[PDB]
């Protein structure tokens, strides 16, 4: 403050007719900083840069990031972020924000599990200003330091709603014909297989049960079969592996289904996305007919 007069009573100071000295940044300089900002997205990491706690010599390693600072946060690749920049005086007083533009990220997270350690890369924005005229103008205002400032997007304006795996669903033959249920969550999760060698494994003595059983993950493949070469795959006792296809010239739908009404089929045409936000953020559990793209 810029006072005019003072007194001093009982160890207390009075200050009358004062002006609050407020120092702002002119619009032309704000626009110059906006134009001179070379913003780019980089793939940075933490100071340690090597997580030796995690290895591929164990059944389960929980990637725990709470032992570090809050700089573990990153940026969603397809999101829009409204960026800015601040400046610090000689006293530590931060100036206002200089809006530089809404800029979209371009690099995703990346975790690579090596034999004895894992490497995580955090996307980070990076603003570069090299116009010496602008920097000298900023310095002339008494500023010394600078810092990044951002406005994060709200759930309504988010490009990305959530991220998660895709799990095929299942449907019973009789219920599907009845449409009481038409689909339902698969009791077992059903990942896709990268190769077709498991089919040859399920033949003769090739398959040892200690390896584990791949679930029925193909689209219309019935969950069940009559071939003893793949007996360990059977998930329901009352299944006969009836294909969900019939010749209309021979039999009706009801008659065809009556051969095995307790038979189930997989359904990759109708899926169930499982994201952490749905489980943890209660706002996503109340969506009703939301228009989104996959």
């Amino acid at each position: 403050i810029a006072p005019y007069t003072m007194t001093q009573k009982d160890n207390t100071l009075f200050l009358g007719n004062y002006t609050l000295k407020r120092s702002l940044i002119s619009t032309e300089l704000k626009n110059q900083i906006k134009s001179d900002s070379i913003v780019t997205t980089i793939l940075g990491g933490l100071d340690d840069a090597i997580e030796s706690e995690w290895n591929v010599n164990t059944q389960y390693n929980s990637n725990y990031d709470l032992n570090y600072d809050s700089r573990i946060k990153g940026f969603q690749k397809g999101e829009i972020y409204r960026l800015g920049i601040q400046f610090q005086d000689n006293k530590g007083k931060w100036s206002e924000v200089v809006f530089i533009g809404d800029y979209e990220c371009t690099e995703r997270f990346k975790y690579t599990q090596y034999d004895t350690y894992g490497i995580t890369l955090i996307p980070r924005f990076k603003v570069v200003i090299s116009n010496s005229t602008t920097i000298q103008a900023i310095k002339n205002l008494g500023y010394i330091n600078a810092r990044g400032v951002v406005v994060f997007p709200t759930l309504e304006d988010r490009n990305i709603l959530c991220q998660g795996i895709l799990c095929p669903t299942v449907a019973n033959y009789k219920d599907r014909l009845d449409n009481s249920p038409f689909v339902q969550s698969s009791w077992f999760s059903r990942p896709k297989q990268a190769t077709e060698t498991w089919k040859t494994e399920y033949s003769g003595t090739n398959h040892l049960s200690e390896f584990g059983e791949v679930p029925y993950f193909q689209h219309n493949e019935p969950i069940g079969s009559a071939s003893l070469s793949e007996i360990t795959r059977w998930e329901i006792q009352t299944s006969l592996g009836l294909v969900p296809y019939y010749n209309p010239s021979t039999t009706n739908a009801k008659d065809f289904v009556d051969g095995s009404p307790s038979e189930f089929l997989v359904d990759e045409n109708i899926v169930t996305m499982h994201s952490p936000d749905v489980e943890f953020d209660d706002r996503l559990q109340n969506i009703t007919n939301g228009k989104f793209k996959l």
Binding site: L177, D178, N179, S180
Partner: protein
């Protein structure tokens, strides 16, 4: 005074049967649930059923 009507189109029906004792037949199926009236609004001919 009667002013109008209601355009019935479908009916959502369900059934449940529980028996104290088991079935008579040792290999009997027991309670069987059939398809009844669980149809969309488009099939409005079979309304009020």
């Amino acid at each position: 005074r009667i002013i109008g009507t209601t355009h019935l189109t479908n009916t959502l029906s369900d059934i449940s049967v529980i028996t104290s004792t088991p079935t008579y037949g040792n290999y009997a199926t027991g309670f069987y649930k059939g398809k009844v009236a669980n149809m969309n609004i488009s099939t409005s001919y079979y309304g009020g059923r």
